[PDB]
């Protein structure tokens, strides 16, 4: 099929209402890999961390898989768009594309 990437689990598309909470995550197989979250193209979510957006990284020993999460709370209409999840490791680079839509 396609080459085997860093993500054991690819992020999935999600839709949320205004003032609701939505969580997106990506799993990377096992030093700690670097993960970047991008909005639309040249916009970095890591520099947009605040009340509305939070970032969290965790490790699960049983499956030897790192879990990366994006936390969105009190979502606003301005947050509707395309989001890119990029994870890089010392030997390989890979990314995924997903869309967050908030309606009504």
């Amino acid at each position: 099929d396609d080459p085997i990437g860093l993500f054991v689990m690819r992020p999935q598309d999600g839709e949320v209402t205004v003032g609701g909470s939505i969580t997106f995550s990506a799993r990377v197989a096992g030093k700690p890999p670097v993960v970047k979250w991008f909005k639309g193209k040249w916009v970095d979510l890591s520099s947009k961390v605040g009340q509305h957006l939070q970032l969290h990284d965790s490790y699960d020993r049983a499956s030897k898989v790192y879990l990366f999460e994006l936390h969105i709370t009190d979502a606003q209409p301005a947050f509707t768009g395309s989001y890119r999840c990029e994870v890089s490791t010392k030997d390989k680079f890979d990314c995924s594309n997903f869309n967050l839509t908030v309606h009504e």
Partner: protein, 370 residues
């Protein structure tokens, strides 16, 4: 027109470029309800911003968005900016470029995020981030000199010669008016009066800005404090409690001069100015001494200029005369610099465009400006 906002610690000054006085002056604070409200007629109003907070100060717990020239919480600042453009200015951010004033050798994140929020949260064609030492230099009207800029947030020194700058010569000092307030509250406790609440923290600051003054000589007044007759005044709290202070009020401003009370190794404001001067070229030193400019919130107290003049003259070489210029309303001088800077046609070309930000990124700020 144009929009000029001063983001210095404690007070948020906003107004229109090309105007001699700003439209909106209020403290930069966010107040939240510490206590549980037990009423059925309230909208509950979880967050309060500006002077509204000052009236409701006792119940609310005040939090400063900006600490040491660095903003701890970004959305609080957004609420402040929203409050300044709409509530007092009554104008849209879209309408004009907005100028913000920033202290020298400030961290990269503050410039990048500040522009990002200005461009994204409030839509504006262009904006510019300026450095306080250079703006005062133009206000002064001199192409060569040394600028000591002490704002409410942090004290900075930035010498200049004929358009050329010396990064090594630029010295950042951690002494500020807010720091004095913390020292002041700490000093009050040994006299038997203790303040451990943010709402009452302002009350000592209020005392400091009008009751406090600067002694010609610290050691001589403190010595004469034992037999105080005219050194003590009565302060009236909203509470109704009566407070009388003596040598305590003039020894607070002293700490900037004498950090040893604070407990920090680093030298006071007059020694730091001298240090910066030494770094600078010998040829330009002579006009540096005769044109010292004082600015900021804590430079307000009378007699500072006289104490600084004798202290700088004594420690410094006598080869040249020492002249210090300390005009009134120097506290608002930083905002004034912002309004005059935005009033220059050449300057408008210089503003950092929204398009430029998106094409290259936040890191271009250092690249574009000094």
């Amino acid at each position: 027109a144009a929009l000029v906002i001063d983001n210095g610690s404690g007070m948020c000054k906003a107004g229109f470029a090309g105007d001699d006085a700003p439209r909106a002056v209020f403290p930069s604070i966010v107040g939240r309800p510490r206590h549980q409200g037990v009423m059925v007629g309230m909208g509950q109003k979880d967050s309060y911003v500006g002077d509204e907070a000052q009236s409701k100060r006792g119940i609310l717990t005040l939090k400063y968005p900006i600490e040491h020239g660095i903003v701890t919480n970004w959305d609080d600042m957004e609420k402040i900016w929203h409050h300044t453009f709409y509530n007092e200015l009554r104008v849209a951010p879209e309408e004009h470029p907005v100028l913000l004033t920033e202290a020298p050798l400030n961290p990269k994140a503050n410039r990048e995020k500040m522009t990002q929020i200005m461009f994204e949260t409030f839509n504006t064609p262009a904006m510019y981030v300026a450095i306080q030492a250079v703006l005062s230099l133009y206000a002064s009207g001199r192409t060569t000199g040394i600028v000591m800029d002490s704002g409410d947030g942090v004290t900075h020194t930035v010498p200049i010669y004929e358009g050329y700058a010396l990064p090594h010569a630029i010295l950042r000092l951690d002494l500020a008016g807010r720091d004095l307030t913390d020292y002041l509250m700490k000093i009050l406790t040994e006299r038997g009066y203790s303040f451990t609440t943010t709402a009452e923290r302002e009350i000592v600051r209020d005392i400091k800005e009008k009751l406090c003054y600067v002694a010609l000589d610290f050691e001589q007044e403190m010595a004469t404090a034992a037999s105080s007759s005219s050194l003590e005044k009565s302060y009236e709290l909203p509470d109704g409690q009566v407070i009388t202070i003596g040598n305590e009020r003039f020894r607070c401003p002293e700490a900037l001069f004498q950090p040893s009370f604070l407990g920090m190794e680093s030298c006071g404001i007059h020694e730091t100015t001298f240090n910066s001067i030494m770094k600078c070229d010998v040829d330009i030193r002579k006009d540096l001494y005769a044109n010292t400019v004082l600015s900021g919130g804590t430079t307000m107290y009378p007699g500072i200029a006289d104490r600084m003049q004798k202290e700088i003259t004594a420690l410094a070489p006598s080869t040249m005369k020492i002249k210090i210029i300390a005009p009134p309303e120097r506290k608002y001088s930083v905002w004034i610099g912002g309004s005059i800077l935005a009033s220059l046609s050449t300057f408008q070309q210089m503003w950092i465009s929204k398009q430029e930000y998106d094409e290259s990124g936040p890191s271009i700020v250092h690249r574009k400006c000094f």
